[PDB]
Paper text:
ExoG is an evolutionarily conserved 5′-3′ exonuclease in higher eukaryotes that is localized in mitochondria. Compared to its paralog, endonuclease G (EndoG), ExoG contains an additional Wing domain at the C-terminus and bears a signature SRGH sequence (instead of DRGH in EndoG) in its catalytic ββα-metal motif. Here, we report that human mitochondrial Exonuclease G (ExoG) may participate in this particular process by efficiently cleaving at RNA–DNA junctions to remove the 5′-end RNA dinucleotide in an RNA/DNA hybrid duplex. Crystal structures of human ExoG bound respectively with DNA, RNA/DNA hybrid and RNA–DNA chimeric duplexes uncover the underlying structural mechanism of how ExoG specifically recognizes and cleaves at RNA–DNA junctions of a hybrid duplex with an A-form conformation.
To further investigate the molecular basis for ExoG’s substrate preference, we next co-crystallized ExoG with an RNA/DNA hybrid duplex (referred to as ExoG–RNA/DNA complex) and an RNA–DNA chimeric duplex containing two RNA nucleotides fused at the 5′-end of a DNA duplex (referred to as ExoG–R2 complex). The chimeric ExoG–R2 complex contained two dimeric ExoG–R2 complexes per asymmetric unit in the P1 unit cell. The three 5′-end nucleotides (–2 to +1) that were bound tightly in the active site all had well-defined electron density maps in the four asymmetric protomers. Importantly, the composite omit electron density maps clearly revealed that the R2-DNA chimeric strand was bound as the scissile strand, demonstrated by the electron density of the 5′-P and the bump on the sugar pucker representing the 2′-OH group of nucleotides –2 and –1. As expected, the three proximal base pairs (located close to the active site of ExoG) of the chimeric substrate adopted an A-form conformation. Comparing the three ExoG complex structures determined in this study, we found additional interactions mediated by residues N176 and N171—which interact respectively with the 2′-OH groups of the –2 and –1 RNA nucleotides—in the ExoG–RNA/DNA and ExoG–R2 complex structures, thereby establishing specific protein-RNA interactions on the scissile strand. To further investigate the molecular mechanism underlying why ExoG cleaves R2-DNA/DNA most efficiently, we compared the active sites of the three complex structures and noticed that the side chain of N171, one of the asparagine residues mediating RNA-specific interactions, slightly tilted toward the scissile phosphate in the ExoG–R2 complex. Intriguingly, this side-chain conformational change brought the N171-coordinated catalytic Mg2+ closer to the scissile phosphate. We found that the averaged Mg-P distance was reduced to ∼2.7 Å in the ExoG–R2 complex, compared to 2.9 Å in the ExoG–DNA complex, and 3.0 Å in the ExoG–RNA/DNA complex.
Residue numbers in the entry:
A (entry chain B): 58 to 318, 325 to 353
B (entry chain A): 58 to 353
DNA sequence: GTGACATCCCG
DNA sequence: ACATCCCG
């Protein structure tokens, strides 16, 4: 019965997973963006001598150029290029970091968001490695509806470039953290949904928190399926802080990262009512005397 | 490496092929609709004892109810439950028809478009069976962008129901036909995208025709991968008519049908009043079903 | 909640 | 566009 139906094959969705040195993903050929991107983080992965300024954005060679995004779509569009698996999670491997610049990892993102609030969540994930031995993170874009005047719910999103790359309304991140491979403690988990726009330091990460069941219904995905849900799972914002770097800390940490790449860093640093920490002063003198 | 990544598995998109008796589809768990639906038509298949009335729409059992559409999402939505694998194409099997009524084969479709223009395409699909041995149809939904005045391109589609089933702006349909298992005539292929609006009889099917490559880029799909593009493939609107039923033929057909259904003299007496009020010439075939029903 | 089975309407 | 420079 089916040999006749399947004579000329079935339409190909391009849905199959694609693993890389340190991240996997499913690609949406219609939207020219990922559907989901999964990564693993540890204290050792965020340490290394891999440099982001050395990488470059470019289409995933493993993606058929037909349904591939291109830098020509992003540049000048008013939207930035936001990796769903940060380069900063692949300090250990310059290769893994390079694969996170394949445009199959990137979506159109608000500049202030990509560098601001969203960035600070990526930071909060790498922080979880100081308290957890293993941290799994799934990220992806979303195009959610908006009820308006007539009460009709309308999904409305922009598409940029000659290839009409979908610009998402919100971004999501599902953080799964395990204390250790030998601990009896339950797993920490929390879903979050951020709007693709500038967000200040006033809103807390907990405000953008959603339930996993809801994020699955909206994204149409089932996250971490092997994970037993009747088993004991805990809220990551209850076990942990769900605390992002406030303006002071956040501005302090950036300066810590800039000195490695001089006299202007300190000048703008103090102007913003910041007291250079000893951890920053130490790194300052070392780089100052080099 | 992967061992560490996959430790709890990857997220499930639910896009794996789902084969049924006489059709296959890839479901969209987010949009609550199929991405593509692949059916096969033949002379024998459009002929059988299968009757629509016996069937009803219902959520597809194979789909997780979390990502399933429901009749409650459609009823009162202002939209109809339009099937992508038609029931009229599965009249030979009592089960293959019933499976088309799974909401995984359905999209929210304009009432007029579904029983009007879209219908004539599905009729013309079943009409290709006369001129062709085998026919392969791949129909599905679309949410195409629209350019504003300032230059932004925007995808703006509607969502309905508690479960938020997406309402496509357009529907597409790829036709692929073979003359006979015996013959050798190169295959006939055509691709068409139809707005989800009410369409008159004024437009003809060649107007809504787009390239397969174009349809593939817009949909994000590659249709019939095995089919060699280098091979001799024929524009089905050159080897065949690509002719739908005009108003007269179409109005004649429905009138012919509504007779047996009608259960009074007024209705039957009005059916013909519509043809002569619409300037249609009743044919002898209809004069029989009319005069026979008149006796009764 | 849906299988079957009646009833009715429209394009 | 491509090299050199600057944003959050
Ligand atoms: Mg980024
Ligand atoms: Mg229909």
């Amino acid at each position: 019965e089916k040999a006749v139906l399947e004579q000329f094959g079935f339409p190909l969705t391009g849905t199959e997973a694609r693993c890389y040195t340190n991240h996997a993903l499913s690609y949406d050929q219609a939207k020219r963006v990922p559907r989901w991107v999964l990564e693993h983080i540890s204290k050792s992965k965020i340490m290394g001598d891999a440099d982001r300024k050395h990488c470059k954005f470019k289409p995933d060679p493993n993606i058929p150029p037909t349904f591939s995004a291109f830098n020509e779509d992003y540049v000048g569009s008013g939207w930035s290029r936001g990796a769903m698996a940060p380069a900063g999670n692949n300090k250990f491997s310059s290769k893994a970091m390079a694969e996170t610049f394949y445009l199959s990892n990137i979506v159109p993102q608000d500049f202030d968001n990509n560098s601001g609030y969203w960035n600070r969540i990526e930071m909060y994930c790498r922080e979880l490695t100081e308290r957890f031995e293993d941290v799994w993170v799934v990220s992806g874009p979303l195009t959610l509806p908006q009820t308006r005047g007539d009460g009709k719910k309308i999904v409305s999103y922009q598409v940029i470039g000659e290839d009409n790359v979908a610009v998402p309304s919100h971004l999501y991140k599902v953080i799964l953290a395990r204390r250790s491979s030998v601990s009896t403690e339950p797993l920490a988990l929390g879903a979050f949904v951020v709007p693709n726009e500038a967000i200040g330091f006033q809103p807390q990460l907990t405000e953008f928190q959603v339930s996993l069941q809801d994020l699955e219904k909206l994204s149409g995905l089932v996250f971490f399926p092997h994970l037993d849900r009747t088993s004991d799972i805990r809220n990551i914002c209850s076990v942990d802080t769900c605390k992002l770097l406030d303006f002071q800390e956040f501005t302090l940490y950036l300066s810590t990262r800039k000195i490695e790449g001089l006299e202007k860093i300190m000048e703008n640093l103090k102007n913003a009512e910041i007291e250079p920490d000893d951890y920053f002063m130490s790194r300052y003198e070392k780089k100052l005397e080099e």
